[PDB]
Amino acid sequence: ADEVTFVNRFTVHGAPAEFESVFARTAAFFARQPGFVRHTLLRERDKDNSYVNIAVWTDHDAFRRALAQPGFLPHATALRALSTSEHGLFTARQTLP
């Protein structure tokens, strides 16, 4: 299978510190799932309420098994309370180096 990259754009409606806490707990959850490779949370420079998360998984099935975990639900609910999300699943076509 090929690696998949999940890209999630967040518009944060409450306090960014609270969002980062909730996000940190979400990321720790995913980080102990089989097939998790890496993640980066990015904050937009000219804004205070704009974030993008990039998460890499070994394959599509590992990503969906993680998302299907009942243990994700509290994290999904908390994130939904604090933010509007637009997400997509991608594959990498070029990487340099």
Next chain:
Amino acid sequence: DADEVTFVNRFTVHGAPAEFESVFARTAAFFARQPGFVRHTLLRERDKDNSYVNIAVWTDHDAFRRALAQPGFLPHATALRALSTSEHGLFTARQTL
């Protein structure tokens, strides 16, 4: 500031995706010769032919800006403008695992 910057550029490709990808490879190689270039990833949305995201990391904003100001960037920018629409943002990494 002196913070590492991550440039996120979302593209809708209206010409041939193969031509878009080829132009991008040459664009990335140009950037790879620029001081302060860290890494480049071109992502394609799964089961869309026409939706891409470039993630480009630079040691700081000034190194990025200077790269975009080089005369050598112009042919690449010109080719991308012929083939795609795009929306960009500049970000700083907040969390990583």
